[PDB]
Symmetry: D2
Subunit: 112 residues, 4 copies
């Protein structure tokens, strides 16, 4: 069934890259996306989307993407449930990126 | 900034419609979206997206949408943080629908 | 760069199916997409989008999709030339009717 | 019915700005959208999409957007006629450069 997400935002931290003994690399980062419908002084808010990326895309994210860089994301919305180390159920909604595009560096509105 | 979600899935329960004394109606429902990339016998999984709808769209959802109906959704991805009644922080990612389209009823693959 | 199109409409005619000299199936159809909001006059307009789909999905388009069938399409917007033509290249198609 | 297009590309020429006899500003520009994946030969192709934007957004397109400027576009796919023309009608435009 149809499931498509497109985002443009800025990374809040530098991307992390973990791995499982199953041998696959899993990159994660948070995308801060300012709301367009409230972009005006006195009411600018952002949403913070969790993006997850795997395999090849995941390493090109760790190399070339840094905290504060503008990135575009294209993917699916997916949900998980796990148990944290305390025994509480955790429900997650993340964007699984099919492609991540590097748009602008960290400080492009003062450097340009 | 760009933020677009498009979904087609089936409702897991009947939509709920709450209200605040601020006088605005807030409709909510969960959309179950089968993954396209695993649609085959032996590996069909779905993701369960929380959709939120307001004002007029929200009532036309409660009238005309029921558990098991196929619905299409178009909107933004948004995040909230609140405190539940126990004092734990709760982080939510939901789809805020701009439009909700009614596609097929509950039992359309046996009635058609 | 990002390029994504998502559509839901009905086919105007029956899906067509050709092949490439490389042996790849090329399914085509036109989708009538009603506008969700009416226009200044109140009438409902539809747009007529040309969709293209490849390989085995194109065969399932030919088998299970007919004139008037409701379909969802997910893909890219691409431009071709001779007369400039724009079509949606579907990587995914969803069959909303049996 | 659902109809959504999202694009990121660069303008091929300078944005144009006309008006309707009803007094609404109509901004137009062409966006060159590079394909993310290369083709069977390995070359990178771009698509050239016609974008249309209205009212005050069209004015901010004329002020702040120039040939070669990077822009994001969010809107509908619509079809017009005389020669069949398909354009993206932008409800939102994002300026990726100052
Ligand atoms: O009714 C139609 N209008 C336009 C078309 F391209 C088509 O196939 N059918
Ligand atoms: O280089 C270009 N190709 C096609 C176009 F429509 C255009 O404006 N520019």
């Amino acid at each position: 069934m149809l499931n498509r997400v497109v985002l443009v935002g800025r990374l809040t931290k530098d991307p992390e890259l973990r791995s499982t003994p199953n041998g696959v690399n899993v990159g994660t980062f948070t995308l801060a996306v300012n709301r367009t419908f409230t972009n005006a002084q006195g009411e600018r808010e952002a949403d913070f989307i969790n993006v997850v990326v795997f395999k090849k895309q995941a390493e090109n994210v760790k190399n070339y993407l840094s905290k504060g860089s503008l990135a575009g994301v294209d993917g699916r919305l997916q949900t998980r449930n796990y148990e944290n180390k305390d025994g509480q159920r955790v429900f997650v909604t993340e964007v699984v990126a099919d492609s991540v595009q590097f748009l602008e560096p960290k400080n492009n509105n003062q450097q340009q």
